[PDB]
Amino acid sequence: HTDLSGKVFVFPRESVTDHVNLITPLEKPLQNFTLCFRAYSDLSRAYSLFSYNTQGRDNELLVYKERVGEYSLYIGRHKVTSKVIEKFPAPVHICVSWESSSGIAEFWINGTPLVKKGLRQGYFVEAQPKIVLGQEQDSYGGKFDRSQSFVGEIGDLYMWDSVLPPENILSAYQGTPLPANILDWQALNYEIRGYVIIKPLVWV
Amino acid sequence: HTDLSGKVFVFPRESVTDHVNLITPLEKPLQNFTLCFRAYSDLSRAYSLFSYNTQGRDNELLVYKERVGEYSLYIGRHKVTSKVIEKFPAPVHICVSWESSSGIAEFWINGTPLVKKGLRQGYFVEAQPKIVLGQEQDSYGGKFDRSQSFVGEIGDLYMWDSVLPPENILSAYQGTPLPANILDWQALNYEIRGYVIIKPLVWV
Amino acid sequence: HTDLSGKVFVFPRESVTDHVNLITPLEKPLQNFTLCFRAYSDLSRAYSLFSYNTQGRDNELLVYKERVGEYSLYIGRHKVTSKVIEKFPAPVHICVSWESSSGIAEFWINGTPLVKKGLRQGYFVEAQPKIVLGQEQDSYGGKFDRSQSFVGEIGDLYMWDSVLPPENILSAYQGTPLPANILDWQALNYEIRGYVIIKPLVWV
Amino acid sequence: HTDLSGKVFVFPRESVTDHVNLITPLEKPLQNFTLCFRAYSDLSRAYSLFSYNTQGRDNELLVYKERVGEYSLYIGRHKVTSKVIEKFPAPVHICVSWESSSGIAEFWINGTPLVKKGLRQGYFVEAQPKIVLGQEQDSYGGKFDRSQSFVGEIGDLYMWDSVLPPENILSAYQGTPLPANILDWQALNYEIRGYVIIKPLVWV
Amino acid sequence: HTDLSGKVFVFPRESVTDHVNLITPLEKPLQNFTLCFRAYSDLSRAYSLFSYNTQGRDNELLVYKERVGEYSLYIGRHKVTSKVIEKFPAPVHICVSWESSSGIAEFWINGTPLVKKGLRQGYFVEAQPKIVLGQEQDSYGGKFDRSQSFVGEIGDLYMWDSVLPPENILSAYQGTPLPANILDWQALNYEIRGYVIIKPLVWV
Numbered sequence A, B, C, D, E: 001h002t003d004l005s006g007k008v009f010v011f012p013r014e015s016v017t018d019h020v021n022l023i024t025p026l027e028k029p030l031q032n033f034t035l036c037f038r039a040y041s042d043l044s045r046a047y048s049l050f051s052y053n054t055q056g057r058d059n060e061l062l063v064y065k066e067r068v069g070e071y072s073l074y075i076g077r078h079k080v081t082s083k084v085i086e087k088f089p090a091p092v093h094i095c096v097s098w099e100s101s102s103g104i105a106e107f108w109i110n111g112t113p114l115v116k117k118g119l120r121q122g123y124f125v126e127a128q129p130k131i132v133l134g135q136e137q138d139s140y141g142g143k144f145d146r147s148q149s150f151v152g153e154i155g156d157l158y159m160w161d162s163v164l165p166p167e168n169i170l171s172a173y174q175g176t177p178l179p180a181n182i183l184d185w186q187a188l189n190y191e192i193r194g195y196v197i198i199k200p201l202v203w204v
């Protein structure tokens, strides 16, 4: 229940411990989800964008940037990666969905669909997560690694417990996002830890 | 048969097992043909796009992507290769025709003609094929190779027993193909084996 | 004798044998000429575009492609080379003229003039040629070299016994050449030898 | 006391001597500032753009160009660097702001925001500066280094004791800057030392 | 006394001999000048564009192309160099001015200003030159060097005994120069030596 409309989290330096915890009362394992957000970073090294771990389970749901032009999704430790043409540095809008019944993962980058990949067909993502921005978890809520830290700005984050169709992804990118039931930027419960500053969104 | 209008086959992972068999009652050897389809892959390694083998004959008709910008056609184990400027990764529309009487093979990539090449003048492509998407055959229906597997999405596949003129290739590129008498995406007889998922086409 | 309007010669493979002889009743040594044609090849190695030899004289008039972006004209074994920015692979329209009185050679690529060069001022190109497409001659009509063979398509070839002014070069580039009196694609006397196929021009 | 509208300082050669002192009446420590200026240089090596040293303190506020596409701000010897896509050589409009309360530094290059970075949260930039263009100070007003000298043109320099919002940054980029209370190009007190020439600005 | 409107000098081959002498009747030292001309060359090696030597003084005023994108001016044996983004090969319009009082040299390439540089403040360029196109002088009228020779085309050359403001530079670039008093293409006194041919300007 904070409205972050028009605002970003700024992670202004590299560190082991600067991060934001995102709080959701998620009790039911996820069969389907979509996650969208905008990010702006001038790192060239690898970094985590969104880290969701559960007790005893590393990389339960992880969105990770390998290198320029390459986005990975981990589900239950397993991973897929898809490629895109992108400028560097540049702001980006990222959406990723995953559907247990097919295993299909869909990345959409600036409203453009990447090649579909598939993993973990039939699996359910475990509930009661710890969700972190700014660092990559290796434990339940911690064991960070500064070489995977996100330095830069993140905004307009939403997470739904369904697979959004293309029209709803384009709405998030450049229209009005559909209100979201797991995490929603207009009513976000978060905890800042360390050096993270909230500022207006000034980039597109 | 099945009308896959608006849908693609998704080969969501690298494997030696995942494939689609395409069924056609082709009993008479082929003198002329055109094959068109759309594909979207972010593989950089080589892969097979369309594998047609007959009893005792490898690479009887094979469309093979050597590397970015380079397309090969095999007829009766002989090959030609032509080059094109293309972005990577990117969706592509591919048409290729071959005419026994001249030996001429014509690739068209996104409605643009590649340099003509020639092979197997006077040859007849044998009938009673096994036709596979997703893997390259080295036997009659099998002996796949993971390093040649196709990972990504294929749709809008049509095959004619004649050489299409430019206007009919552009029609196919634009999404209004002429009726096709060997394989037709709107009345396709196929078998999924392994991990292949049918999804809507979202990238055209 | 044959009107090849709308048609190309296709040299569909690398060889030391495949060629076209162009026949013209040229009995008087040439003081001035312009030669225009369209070509489409995806070779990266060097190749001959137009080979004119006379008895006892190799490289009497030769248009040669050194590498991407570089065009050479030989007159009586001496050469000039001019450079241009071009895409690869791409169709190209090439015009070259030479004027004995000044020695000036003008290349025009896709209707744009290259830097003028000069050679053989005062020379007359010898008459009674053998003129070959598809191979580079080292004798009077023969002694070909596979490594200089042209693979690809040639069309719209015209040769005048004068130096065309710019607006006449542009007319030829646009597909409306002024009347040509040495070689004329719309009334061409030729001989196919080996594997050369006439097909419609589909890339203009 | 001088309106330099429409004019630039030209540092026409590499040297360890040529520089401009900028004189400001500011006597209180700075908690917030914005600095904007336009520069045109064809140096590839690193160079100082704006050097603000105070007695006893090197690099108290320093704007430094590491290499093409990379801009650094030093505050009290600590630094941040942000990246941008830019052509070389090219004129550039540079703005940078810093806010003590958050430590946030914002670079804007040709009206486009770079990724925010943070340093020196809670710090006060010392007053009674010597402010130098053309050279990088290693002492209070001197100790220059030829290899960090600025060669080229600088104009349209303004410095405010506040953090400008995006609209006011864009106004400056577009040529209608707000009046500026630390340094103002339209009412500037300066001292030329060595070879620095004032000329009309011809490159906007 | 010759009007070369619409014509160029073509230096069609590398040599240590081919050149044009340009003769001015204005006999006076130069405190200010501007020189404009068009050039088209596909050399990659260094070459002289305009060579002005006086008795016993080499490199008294020299415009020299170091390599792609780099232009140098020598005044009295001292030099400056400025860089520009340009295509290769490409026609170019070059203007350069120099002002003794400030030492400032201004290059303009296709109507766009390069970074100003400065040299020889207070010097007077000596009177009674030999002015050569096509070769770089090392003596008064001679001692050429084939590795510095200009191959290609030069036209629309004008030289004024003043520093042109930007609007007059743009007029020259656009083909409507102000009449010029040191050298003027519409009333030029020149001597061709060796192989230099006058042809129409076809590349503007």
Ligand SMILES: *[C@@H]1O[C@H](CO)[C@@H](O)[C@H](O)[C@H]1NC(C)=O
Pocket (backbone or CB within 6 Å): A030, A031, A032, A101, A161
């Ligand atoms: C996931 O979606 C599938 C099909 O769209 C549906 O069967 C299932 O109920 C969804 N799961 C949940 C928990 O909503």
Ligand SMILES: *[C@@H]1O[C@H](CO)[C@@H](O)[C@H](O)[C@H]1NC(C)=O
Pocket (backbone or CB within 6 Å): B031, B032, B099, B101, B161
């Ligand atoms: C194949 O094409 C050739 C050339 O157009 C034609 O003559 C022949 O009839 C065709 N063959 C069949 C089986 O249609």
Ligand SMILES: *[C@@H]1O[C@H](CO)[C@@H](O)[C@H](O)[C@H]1NC(C)=O
Pocket (backbone or CB within 6 Å): C031, C032, C099, C101
């Ligand atoms: C070749 O061109 C020159 C120069 O224009 C001309 O004088 C000469 O007559 C021409 N030669 C011919 C037509 O044989």
Ligand SMILES: *[C@@H]1O[C@H](CO)[C@@H](O)[C@H](O)[C@H]1NC(C)=O
Pocket (backbone or CB within 6 Å): D031, D032, D099, D101, D162, D163
């Ligand atoms: C510095 O800038 C901030 C802008 O958020 C402002 O709130 C604060 O009052 C300023 N401090 C001073 C000393 O002016």
Ligand SMILES: *[C@@H]1O[C@H](CO)[C@@H](O)[C@H](O)[C@H]1NC(C)=O
Pocket (backbone or CB within 6 Å): E031, E032, E099, E162, E163
């Ligand atoms: C040189 O040019 C400047 C303007 O650029 C002018 O003010 C000055 O009078 C000129 N000097 C002469 C003509 O000697």
Ligand SMILES: [Ca+2]
Pocket (backbone or CB within 6 Å): A058, A059, A136, A137, A138, A139
């Ligand atoms: Ca982890």
Ligand SMILES: [Ca+2]
Pocket (backbone or CB within 6 Å): A136, A137, A138, A143, A144, A145, A148
């Ligand atoms: Ca980790």
Ligand SMILES: [Ca+2]
Pocket (backbone or CB within 6 Å): B058, B059, B136, B137, B138, B139
């Ligand atoms: Ca095979």
Ligand SMILES: [Ca+2]
Pocket (backbone or CB within 6 Å): B136, B137, B138, B143, B144, B145, B148
């Ligand atoms: Ca195989």
Ligand SMILES: [Ca+2]
Pocket (backbone or CB within 6 Å): C058, C059, C136, C137, C138, C139
């Ligand atoms: Ca030869």
Ligand SMILES: [Ca+2]
Pocket (backbone or CB within 6 Å): C136, C137, C138, C143, C144, C145, C148
């Ligand atoms: Ca040869």
Ligand SMILES: [Ca+2]
Pocket (backbone or CB within 6 Å): D058, D059, D136, D137, D138, D139
């Ligand atoms: Ca310093």
Ligand SMILES: [Ca+2]
Pocket (backbone or CB within 6 Å): D136, D137, D138, D143, D144, D145, D148
């Ligand atoms: Ca220093």
Ligand SMILES: [Ca+2]
Pocket (backbone or CB within 6 Å): E058, E059, E136, E137, E138, E139
């Ligand atoms: Ca010299």
Ligand SMILES: [Ca+2]
Pocket (backbone or CB within 6 Å): E136, E137, E138, E143, E144, E145, E148
């Ligand atoms: Ca010399």
